[PDB]
Symmetry: D2
Subunit: 332 residues, 4 copies
């Protein structure tokens, strides 16, 4: 089995272990964070939005035993000092949020791993993959890659269909996004100087910037420079949606758009016709779930403006995309 | 001394009484609801989002005493039976949500009131007023008028400035809206058959339809048929924003758009440049609060798509617009 | 199979259908509510706190198809007129909240059903059962019984162990309880005149009365008149805990109380030693989950005051208790 | 002209400045935190639970101007490098949460400040004052004192009335408490190793320990060893209540208790008879607000168990008590 280490046992890291535990041929040999093993085990077993872990998890000296198999636990904030070489670690899932570019992420390779997947945008100099859209750009010679953002994994399959079947002149994106741990619990100073993320997460609609639309060219080259957008964090603990308002190169109807999305559906890109809300998306394994009920095509004097909306669980949808990308990568 | 009756002592009705108490030339002679006076007084004094009433409020038999002055209390679900003639009520604020067209609202005229203002869209059979945009369409001979919806009062001043300064080809609106009482507390059947308002209000992003953009022609005739949009209810108990993505007739910059909004700012239309969030808008008295920090102009190959955003407290912003429209109307 | 009808396809009614679907020998033949079948199907499939239904659910004409089996759907607010006799309904789960005494619940018997279980306190004149505590009082000749409240199913197994092993002089209960559908979404008039349930559910700590402790005598007769208590509704959509502060008849230690609770553990009464919070209880199938980490026995000059705490998902814990009582009841007749 | 410096411009620090701006004879000369002045001004002006600041607030060169008066701003995480001596700081309000004992708080003294008031429990070797209960223990010669915790300021006036009017044998406290910043936004590792504060603050009922009842002896010596309790954090951003279940030394009625609380009510200890909920308490200036509607006296064979409940805005109630203690203390230095 390919051996994986998870650096950062947070929301994405812990769910990544859940998904990898359900996979065969790949196993997690070690996890690293800033806390003792008892804290990590408790958070792995009990989850406020994703439910209890469906499996066995017990504590040992400096390890957790998951489904009968031992996983080493480390608490070292500097990746260069981790024993990845000693443990034969092939791929590191970098999920701390503090090593989100190539030079920082390479500390893992100096620690003895062969490859690193960043669970976030990683810059314009590393390949960036949304599984189901462009995973084929990988050939295994890359040392550091990126699985993009949760929002990019939601937007990209929707935008890819619009570009291929109708063509895109331009588009503005709005993601209505669950609050995350980078927002404060209550009004307090923020480490990055962000005056809006400084505010109480569960009390506010919080405008915030996102690069998912601007950087879309890394996933869909033909859309480079055609999209921008922003985000609104709102008080749901997980579950999000992405709206895209676009000008297309050809006329379209709501029925034509919806039919194209369904034709492109896959394990990564679901198609929905029910009148769902965000909680219905919690825990889904699609990276993106197009919502045909929200498609709108407005025609005013022959000029068309199109709205398309797709849901995503920013935690579990992205985690499943990250693990799919990891598995595809690990075979090269 | 124009005498007012409030039919429906809910969120809008109770806040309207707060505002009318601070107003000159208008006084509330009576309120009506489905509940005893003790319940109405308690809800007037204590408010979970708008704070405690800053004034005196005591109970008398079949009456409440507000700031030393008597207001009669009735509990009659049949408006046709209310004693508006014997009390001499000049204007009724119809705020129950159950009498939102001319034929139903005229029950107050048969009951002896002289005028009715509906605190919601009232159908195309009724003049619809956003104060600060089109109040001049009132000549005073109208019997029943409408103050539009909260979203309309937010959108109209923003769209009016864009139309005046640049011209609008078309636009799609997305309002990220506080949950309201027409949503269920927990998943349960919904009276109107709405599968999304059936869901727990405080747990979900809930897509829902709205006519604010569709009906904008009633307030700004030159924009008739050029705007559409929809809503997303999110878990804040009050406070909302409206995004408009539009194609304009002339080139624009972020600085030009913001300067025009600031020049037009007023008591009905505020202008903001701080990094605010939704809780900062709770209790504001603007009908709409333009947010210059969210203005975006995207240009791709000479083609432009424009994003503008305005905040509004769907409760208090609309209530102040309703009272402004009431005062203007009563002067004719 | 025993054929069951659910009157009131609400939180308890819909989750009861999920649990009965997993049970053998008992089947839900019909559900009734105030709404069209498409609305009921959608709410059965999608649930904001309990997750998507793990099964198949499709629509037919005045029926829903669940796991390949048809369930007729009705929309009649008056239970007298439901076709329970025509459908051979043995037991009706009365979950509307509007027929919570014996004479009202008997509308289902006049409609052709043989038996009724009320999913709430049903008054002092009907047998009231917490499964795992007093289900043995059912001999099958009863027509209308009650499965008590969610809080009673949480309190009763905990209080029973205290009574048997230490004896209870008196106790005051405080249940910290998730908000429910009887609270308004925002500040608004309340149908029952309750000034505190009138307030926005997800914004407030809301004091409210509860009869679970006062009525405990119906489940544990030896505790009749020895308990009272109250509730605090808080902004979690489901998941609750019950604290009991009691004076015992004999000295106790934290370890002795915890050992007694674990010894009494079962499928209805779980035992927990982890540092859990309310979200960890969402969806559990225990009727009550004792939390050994919160036990406190205080001694001041030989005088002892004891705190014991149990968790419960007021929706799913109670629903499973309701179905367990339904299954035991249907076995007797 | 008492000059105050606020170390830690958090929830308590920012509200403390709001209240001191309304106080005569005392003024804030400087504030210190870990962040640039622009962030601090923004958080002072805009507040998600306490509303916008009712006053003027603008930015200047490494300072904020509040109501026309400039307040220097510092960003030094080491307290004993601060220029308190150069600025003439008389009293430092220590509100960081990182210097909550005499040894750490004395960094402000070595930095040239005369006095320090810790906005939290400060250890058994620092005088602890709940204003309105025991401020008379201060004689002005102390260098480091404590204003206790928010829960202590809520419990103490209530327990003092019960002790004076009836006498207390023992009592167990349960505080239903707003979530605070020491809880994580979402499930994540927690710096102090607390498995329950590690969990999502706004999604959970979270059991947690508190020392308010055990340490009550520092404020009311006659109750030393007589009280204990714990806390339950719930998803309200501010606003809390404290329940006390106590055994009293003489018989009592709810009417007697409520009358005694009402007679003792003051600016520090309010009395309420309306059916309020937690949002009604946000921003109040009482340190504790007794709720007579929740008083319960249970009698079982002559044995009595008493429940009394008091509200408090854990932020603003405590801040007002802190400023009251500061004014009394400063009048003696
Ligand atoms: N949460 C989402 O919806 C989401 C979606 C897609 C991507 N991401 C990305 O995943 C990453 C993690 O986000 P998250 O939401 O899981 O955040 P989180 O804070 O829940 O997880 C971060 C974890 O890393 C640990 N950590 C921090 N510094 C460390 C260090 N030097 N060494 C070891 N461990 C360290 C922390 O203790 C924490 O457990 C970020 O890059 C984020 O942008 C998050
Ligand atoms: N809340 C908002 O954000 C908002 C904004 C703009 C407009 N509105 C509109 O204002 C109206 C009221 O909405 P709300 O949010 O105040 O709703 P609400 O439910 O808070 O208030 C409605 C009130 O009317 C009473 N009522 C119902 N039927 C009645 C009858 N037959 N006779 C007398 N009283 C009766 C109810 O008891 C309740 O107090 C609706 O038309 C709504 O669309 C609401
Ligand atoms: N939810 C809990 O935590 C909980 C726990 C234990 C017991 N209960 C009890 O269960 C019962 C239902 O509570 P719930 O939480 O499911 O409430 P709910 O409002 O979710 O469900 C009630 C359902 O009954 C329907 N209904 C109402 N009147 C009707 C009528 N005349 N005919 C047919 N259908 C009708 C409603 O449409 C609704 O779907 C109540 O007695 C409640 O006290 C609830
Ligand atoms: N919030 C309440 O309900 C409450 C009530 C009573 C007492 N308290 C106590 O008050 C204190 C502050 O709590 P809070 O709720 O305001 O927390 P907070 O985190 O909101 O405030 C702490 C502030 O101190 C700053 N800070 C941290 N370390 C610092 C350092 N070394 N130097 C300078 N500034 C530093 C932080 O940036 C932050 O602005 C704690 O001791 C807490 O227990 C809180």
């Amino acid at each position: 089995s390919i051996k994986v280490a998870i650096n950062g046992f947070g929301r994405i890291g812990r769910l990544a272990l859940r998904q990898i535990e359900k996979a065969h041929g790949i196993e997690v040999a070690a996890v690293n964070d800033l806390t003792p093993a008892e804290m990590l085990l408790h958070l792995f077993k009990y989850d406020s939005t994703q439910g209890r872990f469906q499996g066995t998890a017990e504590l040992k000296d400096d390890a957790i035993v998951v489904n009968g198999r031992e996983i080493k636990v480390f608490a070292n904030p500097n990746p260069e000092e981790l024993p990845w070489g000693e443990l034969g670690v092939d791929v590191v899932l970098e999920c701390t949020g503090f090593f989100t570019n190539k030079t920082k992420a390479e500390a893992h390779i100096r620690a003895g791993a062969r490859k690193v997947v960043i669970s976030a945008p990683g810059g314009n100099d590393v390949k960036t993959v949304v599984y189901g859209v462009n995973q084929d750009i990988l050939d295994g010679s890359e040392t550091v890659i990126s699985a993009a953002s949760c929002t990019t994994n939601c937007l990209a399959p929707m935008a890819a269909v619009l570009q291929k079947e109708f063509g895109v002149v331009e588009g503005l994106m709005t993601t209505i996004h669950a609050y995350t741990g980078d927002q404060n619990t209550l009004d307090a100073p923020h480490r990055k100087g962000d005056l809006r993320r400084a505010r109480a997460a569960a009390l506010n609609i919080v405008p915030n910037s996102t690069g998912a639309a601007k950087a879309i060219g890394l996933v869909i080259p033909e859309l480079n420079g055609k999209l921008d957008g922003s985000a609104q964090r709102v008080p749901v603990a997980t579950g999000s949606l992405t709206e895209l308002v676009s000008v297309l190169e050809r006329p379209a109807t709501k029925e034509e758009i919806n039919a194209a999305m369904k034709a492109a559906s896959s394990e990564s890109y679901g198609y929905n016709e029910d009148q769902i809300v965000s909680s219905d998306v919690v825990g889904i394994e699609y990276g993106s779930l197009f919502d045909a009920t929200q498609t709108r095509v407005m025609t005013v004097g022959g000029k068309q403006l199109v709205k398309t909306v797709a849901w995503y669980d920013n935690e579990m949808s992205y985690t499943c995309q990250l693990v799919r990308t990891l598995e595809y990568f690990a075979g090269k």
